[PDB]
Structure 1
Amino acid sequence: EMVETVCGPVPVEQLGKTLIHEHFLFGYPGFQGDVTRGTFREDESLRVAVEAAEKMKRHGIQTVVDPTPNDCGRNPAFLRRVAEETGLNIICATGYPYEGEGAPPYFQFRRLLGTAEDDIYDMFMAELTEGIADTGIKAGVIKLASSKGRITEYEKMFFRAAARAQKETGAVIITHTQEGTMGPEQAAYLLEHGADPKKIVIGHMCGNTDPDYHRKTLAYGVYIAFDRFGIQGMVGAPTDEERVRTLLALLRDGYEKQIMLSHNTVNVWLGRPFTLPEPFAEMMKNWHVEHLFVNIIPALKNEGIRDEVLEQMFIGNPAALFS
């Protein structure tokens, strides 16, 4: 009935229109060592974050889930300044990135000692039920991630921990899948360990353009997220055209109570600034929090999709997810 946000418990009935996967801040593990040339600029990162919040608000969004992993710049007090300022509900995560874009040494060492999976459980339970650091903020979701073509033995520790914490807390799990692989594998493995499919979102499912792969994942009763709209031409991601063609096929099959959409924006990169070459930079040009509402959703409406299907995905599914 309630979900923990960066501003404390909010009734699930009041979450409203929700973007299921956006980052206000994100840094790739390793950004911490580049502090000298990549200092966190708090005032300017707040104004950009707050502006992103305002743009989402102009398209009706009342709630963002920000699943930034723990060592990737997750900053609950920062998110609370965004939420206090804009009135947006923001739900944060507890979780670690996949091995390929992570820093596994800390928990690999604890796996050597035989305490890793229990330690991850402990962290999940502390941040879900007591709070993150001294912020007073509980994560509302557990974030999981797997590698391309594999859920590594390291990653499996987090999956089992997440299942155990879900059984005890009822917390929503949100996953990352790499390059359109392991959707069905994630669902089956979470279910193996007693996780509840009604509380699981298998993410980055737009990374795969075969509706059969999607159906194999949906068959577990989990949600799937087409959560990378705008990301085109980079690290294996397909085009928004193929995302839409895949989604339309799922919607015409009646799967809208299982689908949620997002962009996976990074509104403020942590570490040193960068610029993409315009081959990439012009194809990444629609990767912003308004893209679903200015480019994608209208196109869907012009291909048959009704308002009540959109409301199911943006409003009904989050409400069901968190309750």
Structure 2
Amino acid sequence: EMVETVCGPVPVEQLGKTLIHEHFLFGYPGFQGDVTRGTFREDESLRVAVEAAEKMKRHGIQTVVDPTPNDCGRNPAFLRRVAEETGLNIICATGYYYEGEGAPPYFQFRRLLGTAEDDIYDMFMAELTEGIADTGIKAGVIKLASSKGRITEYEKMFFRAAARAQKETGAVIITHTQEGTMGPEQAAYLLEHGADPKKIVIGHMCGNTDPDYHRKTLAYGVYIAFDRFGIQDRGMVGMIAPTDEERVRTLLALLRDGYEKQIMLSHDTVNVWLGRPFTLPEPFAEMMKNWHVEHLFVNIIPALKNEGIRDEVLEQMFIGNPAALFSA
């Protein structure tokens, strides 16, 4: 009945309206090496993060899960300052970024020592139950991710460690999938290893526009997240994301099938980029103009209500699902 937040344990019944995937700070691994030209401006960053939090609060949001991975600039103390300033509950994660073009050598080195999976498991337990770094702050979720079209051997170490930690703690697992792939594979692999489907959120499911893919994932009993609202088409340099229009189409088909108790919604904003600032060129910026923490509320919700979605169903997704997810 409690969940760990950056301000300590909070009753799950008090989380209220929740955004399941948003980043106050985020940096792509490697940002740390660009410290000279890409210094962290903590005061200015706290201001921007506090403003983002207040914009969420504008729409009744009481809780945010910020699943920034350990190698992507996760900063629990900074998050505590945001929470203390705004009264928002913020839940952070323990986890590493997916492999990408290739695995970082640290845990690859330890795999060759034969201890990597055990070390990762130990990291998860420490961070879920003892405290992160120089603080007593505990993570409330394990963050996993897989690559496009495969869960790599590197990534599987974290999946196995997460299932183990999940069994010991009852902690929630949040994932990120790359380019609308591996949703069924993620669920199947975690479930093979004894993870509880009612404690799993398969992320970035909005990146696939085929409801049959969503149904194949939903059949495992897991939650899914349409968590990149506002990231449209070629707006971000990485991939080609779907449009919001396509997300909404996909979502409405699932809500019409009555899957509302398995779906959560978010934007995956990055409110402060770590490392050196950058700009997007004119036409793509236009594609990203709605990528902000209010978008779901001021744009997506009214579209859904005009399409016949009731407040009961919306509140199931924003309130009921997070409460169930984080409950025993």
TM-score band by shorter chain is over 0.9
After superposition, give the CA deviation of every residue in 1:1-55 in whole Å (9 maximum; x if it has no partner). 0000000000000000000000000000010000000000000000000000000
Aligned 8 A contact 2:96 2:143 in 1:
yes
SS of residue matched to 2:71: coil
For 2:312 and 2:164, locate their aligned partners in 1 and report how far apart those are by CA, in whole Å: 35
> Residue 270 and residue 102 in structure 1: after superposition, are their counterparts in 2 closer, same or farther (change >3 A)?
farther
For 2:101 and 2:214, locate their aligned partners in 1 and report how far apart those are by CA, in whole Å: 24
Quote the sequence identity (%): 99
For 2:187 and 2:159, locate their aligned partners in 1 and report how far apart those are by CA, in whole Å: 10
Task: Point out where structure 2 has 5 or more consecutive residues left out of the alignment.
Answer: none
Task: Point out where structure 1 has 5 or more consecutive residues left out of the alignment.
Answer: none
Aligned 8 A contact 1:223 1:258 in 2:
yes
> Residue 102 and residue 28 in structure 1: after superposition, are their counterparts in 2 closer, same or farther (change >3 A)?
farther
Aligned 8 A contact 1:29 1:101 in 2:
no
Query: Structure 2-normalised TM-score?
Result: 0.97
Between 1:225-234 and 1:246-255, the stretch displaced more is 225-234
Moved over 4 A (4+): none
Aligned 8 A contact 2:103 2:154 in 1:
no
After superposition, give the CA deviation of every residue in 1:70-94 in whole Å (9 maximum; x if it has no partner). 0100000000000001000000000
1:279 Cα deviation (Å)?
1.7
Between 1:94-103 and 1:248-257, the stretch displaced more is 94-103
Query: Structure 1-normalised TM-score?
Result: 0.99
The aligned length equals: 323
After superposition, give the CA deviation of every residue in 1:208-234 in whole Å (9 maximum; x if it has no partner). 000000000000000000000000143
Aligned 8 A contact 1:38 1:273 in 2:
yes
Between 1:51-60 and 1:236-245, the stretch displaced more is 236-245
1:280 Cα deviation (Å)?
1.3
Q: CA RMSD in A?
A: 0.9
> Residue 103 and residue 45 in structure 1: after superposition, are their counterparts in 2 closer, same or farther (change >3 A)?
farther
Q: Select the residue among 283, 295, 309 that pairs with 2:299.
A: 295
Between 1:226-235 and 1:143-152, the stretch displaced more is 226-235
Between 1:7-16 and 1:99-108, the stretch displaced more is 99-108
What's the counterpart of residue 229 of structure 2? 229
For 2:65 and 2:139, locate their aligned partners in 1 and report how far apart those are by CA, in whole Å: 10
For 1:318 and 1:154, locate their aligned partners in 2 and report how far apart those are by CA, in whole Å: 29
1:101 Cα deviation (Å)?
6.6
> Residue 231 and residue 20 in structure 1: after superposition, are their counterparts in 2 closer, same or farther (change >3 A)?
same
For 1:104 and 1:156, locate their aligned partners in 2 and report how far apart those are by CA, in whole Å: 14
Between 1:298-307 and 1:236-245, the stretch displaced more is 236-245
1:268 Cα deviation (Å)?
0.2
Aligned 8 A contact 1:22 1:67 in 2:
yes
For 1:307 and 1:321, locate their aligned partners in 2 and report how far apart those are by CA, in whole Å: 20
After superposition, give the CA deviation of every residue in 1:172-226 in whole Å (9 maximum; x if it has no partner). 0000000000000000000000000000000000000000000000000000000
